[PDB]
Design an enzyme around this catalytic site. Sequence first.
Site, PDB file in Angstrom:
ATOM      1  N   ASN A  11       0.911  -1.150   0.000  1.00  0.00           N
ATOM      2  CA  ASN A  11       0.000   0.000   0.000  1.00  0.00           C
ATOM      3  C   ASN A  11       0.951   1.202   0.000  1.00  0.00           C
ATOM      4  O   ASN A  11       1.746   1.363   0.930  1.00  0.00           O
ATOM      5  CB  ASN A  11      -0.863  -0.113   1.276  1.00  0.00           C
ATOM      6  CG  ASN A  11      -1.825   1.062   1.499  1.00  0.00           C
ATOM      7  OD1 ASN A  11      -2.199   1.320   2.641  1.00  0.00           O
ATOM      8  ND2 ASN A  11      -2.275   1.718   0.432  1.00  0.00           N
ATOM      9  N   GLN A  44      -2.286   6.767  -1.230  1.00  0.00           N
ATOM     10  CA  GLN A  44      -2.568   7.887  -0.335  1.00  0.00           C
ATOM     11  C   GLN A  44      -1.388   8.841  -0.322  1.00  0.00           C
ATOM     12  O   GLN A  44      -0.252   8.437  -0.613  1.00  0.00           O
ATOM     13  CB  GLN A  44      -2.811   7.413   1.108  1.00  0.00           C
ATOM     14  CG  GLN A  44      -4.264   6.977   1.421  1.00  0.00           C
ATOM     15  CD  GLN A  44      -4.544   5.545   1.093  1.00  0.00           C
ATOM     16  OE1 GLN A  44      -3.669   4.673   1.207  1.00  0.00           O
ATOM     17  NE2 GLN A  44      -5.767   5.273   0.685  1.00  0.00           N
ATOM     18  N   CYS A  73      -5.207   6.383   8.596  1.00  0.00           N
ATOM     19  CA  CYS A  73      -4.605   5.444   7.665  1.00  0.00           C
ATOM     20  C   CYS A  73      -3.548   4.685   8.452  1.00  0.00           C
ATOM     21  O   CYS A  73      -2.570   5.284   8.925  1.00  0.00           O
ATOM     22  CB  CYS A  73      -3.990   6.140   6.457  1.00  0.00           C
ATOM     23  SG  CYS A  73      -3.129   4.917   5.361  1.00  0.00           S
ATOM     24  N   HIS A 159     -15.663   1.744   8.761  1.00  0.00           N
ATOM     25  CA  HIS A 159     -15.467   0.408   8.213  1.00  0.00           C
ATOM     26  C   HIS A 159     -16.731  -0.397   8.357  1.00  0.00           C
ATOM     27  O   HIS A 159     -17.407  -0.319   9.379  1.00  0.00           O
ATOM     28  CB  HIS A 159     -14.349  -0.308   8.959  1.00  0.00           C
ATOM     29  CG  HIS A 159     -13.033   0.386   8.846  1.00  0.00           C
ATOM     30  ND1 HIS A 159     -12.107   0.062   7.879  1.00  0.00           N
ATOM     31  CD2 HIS A 159     -12.510   1.419   9.549  1.00  0.00           C
ATOM     32  CE1 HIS A 159     -11.051   0.852   8.011  1.00  0.00           C
ATOM     33  NE2 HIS A 159     -11.273   1.687   9.014  1.00  0.00           N
ATOM     34  N   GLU A 208     -11.382  -0.185  -0.358  1.00  0.00           N
ATOM     35  CA  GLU A 208     -11.243   1.080   0.357  1.00  0.00           C
ATOM     36  C   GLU A 208     -12.146   2.184  -0.143  1.00  0.00           C
ATOM     37  O   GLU A 208     -12.354   2.335  -1.343  1.00  0.00           O
ATOM     38  CB  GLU A 208      -9.831   1.619   0.216  1.00  0.00           C
ATOM     39  CG  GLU A 208      -8.719   0.787   0.814  1.00  0.00           C
ATOM     40  CD  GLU A 208      -7.408   1.562   0.828  1.00  0.00           C
ATOM     41  OE1 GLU A 208      -7.385   2.762   1.214  1.00  0.00           O
ATOM     42  OE2 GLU A 208      -6.373   0.973   0.515  1.00  0.00           O
ATOM     43  N   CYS A 217      -4.647  -2.767   3.838  1.00  0.00           N
ATOM     44  CA  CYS A 217      -5.252  -1.646   4.560  1.00  0.00           C
ATOM     45  C   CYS A 217      -5.118  -1.908   6.040  1.00  0.00           C
ATOM     46  O   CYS A 217      -5.799  -2.770   6.581  1.00  0.00           O
ATOM     47  CB  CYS A 217      -6.749  -1.430   4.270  1.00  0.00           C
ATOM     48  SG  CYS A 217      -7.226   0.212   4.764  1.00  0.00           S
ATOM     49  N   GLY A 220      -8.182  -1.092   8.037  1.00  0.00           N
ATOM     50  CA  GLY A 220      -9.147  -2.172   7.742  1.00  0.00           C
ATOM     51  C   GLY A 220      -8.839  -3.400   8.578  1.00  0.00           C
ATOM     52  O   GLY A 220      -9.756  -4.063   9.078  1.00  0.00           O
TER      53      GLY A 220
HETATM   54  C1  LIG Z   1      -6.143   1.178   3.716  1.00  0.00           C
HETATM   55  C2  LIG Z   1      -5.559   2.398   4.449  1.00  0.00           C
HETATM   56  N1  LIG Z   1      -4.585   2.950   3.598  1.00  0.00           N
HETATM   57  C3  LIG Z   1      -6.668   3.351   4.695  1.00  0.00           C
HETATM   58  C4  LIG Z   1      -6.686   4.609   3.806  1.00  0.00           C
HETATM   59  C5  LIG Z   1      -7.897   5.523   4.092  1.00  0.00           C
HETATM   60  C6  LIG Z   1      -9.200   5.079   3.417  1.00  0.00           C
HETATM   61  N2  LIG Z   1      -9.096   5.166   1.976  1.00  0.00           N
HETATM   62  C7  LIG Z   1     -10.339   5.984   3.833  1.00  0.00           C
HETATM   63  O1  LIG Z   1     -10.862   6.794   3.021  1.00  0.00           O
HETATM   64  O2  LIG Z   1     -10.723   5.909   5.014  1.00  0.00           O
HETATM   65  C8  LIG Z   1      -4.968   1.964   5.713  1.00  0.00           C
HETATM   66  O3  LIG Z   1      -5.502   2.130   6.842  1.00  0.00           O
HETATM   67  O4  LIG Z   1      -3.824   1.456   5.611  1.00  0.00           O
END
Ligand SMILES: *C[C@@](N)(CCC[C@H](N)C(=O)O)C(=O)O
EC number: 5.1.1.7
Length: 274
Positions: A11, A44, A73, A159, A208, A217, A220
């Site tokens: 990621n 990200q 994140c 989530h 995501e 994630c 996640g």
């Molecule tokens: C998967 C992860 N990068 C979460 C990123 C944020 C997600 N797109 C959101 O919009 O909440 C992580 O936690 O590693």
Amino acid sequence: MQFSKMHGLGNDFVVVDGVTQNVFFTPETIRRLANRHCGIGFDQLLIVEAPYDPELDFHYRIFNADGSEVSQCGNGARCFARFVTLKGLTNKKDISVSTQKGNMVLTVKDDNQIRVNMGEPIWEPAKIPFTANKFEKNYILRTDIQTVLCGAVSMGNPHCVVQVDDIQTANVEQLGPLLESHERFPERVNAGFMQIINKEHIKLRVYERGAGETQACGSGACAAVAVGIMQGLLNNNVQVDLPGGSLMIEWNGVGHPLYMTGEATHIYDGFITL
Ligand SMILES: *C[C@@](N)(CCC[C@H](N)C(=O)O)C(=O)O
């Protein structure tokens, strides 16, 4: 603008020092930069900022590839720890950061992995945010092709966690998009699909919010384990296998912070004019 590229379990992140630089941009610029063929390419983008509470070390901001700003994140938090250490913004073993929501603590372990205190999981529907009459351990989410059951929880981001019999054949491709923008989640949601191997071991895929299915994630992984524990299907320490590798999640239950441990890797440094 100087930046670094990093990843956690595949990621991948652009990480920007916004302490010694003045960093800001439009969602259009974020989307341009996220593009893998015409931009930098990332899942990200994170910014390291000076803290608003001077007792903390840094403020932590997170942007999705779609240009949206969010408040958590997990893989990014580990990368953030590796970045501020490698780049000499701090040399502390335990680094305290704020986000738009709650605080977190990032611990650089002697084996170089990072253990993140992600804060306490949030269950109250209005806070997730998630539309529900009452808190429940399982909620019913109707979609066009199937009604599913999920746990719902926030780790700073929302989530929905669906249990599946077989992670490889779970219909992530069709259900993920339907859940990610489900009407009951007013700010959208990260849709997790969890296969429980035993009480200390799951396999997980996450569709995501604002990024789709990626290699891993962390938040996640946190959410899936929190939900399994809340449902009495998992123990308090759980190995989570994601496409890109594994994380260790530890949570002793309500009132307690949840911990997430795993890798973080610096790849290269870059310079770009916005
Ligand atoms: C998967 C992860 N990068 C979460 C990123 C944020 C997600 N797109 C959101 O919009 O909440 C992580 O936690 O590693």
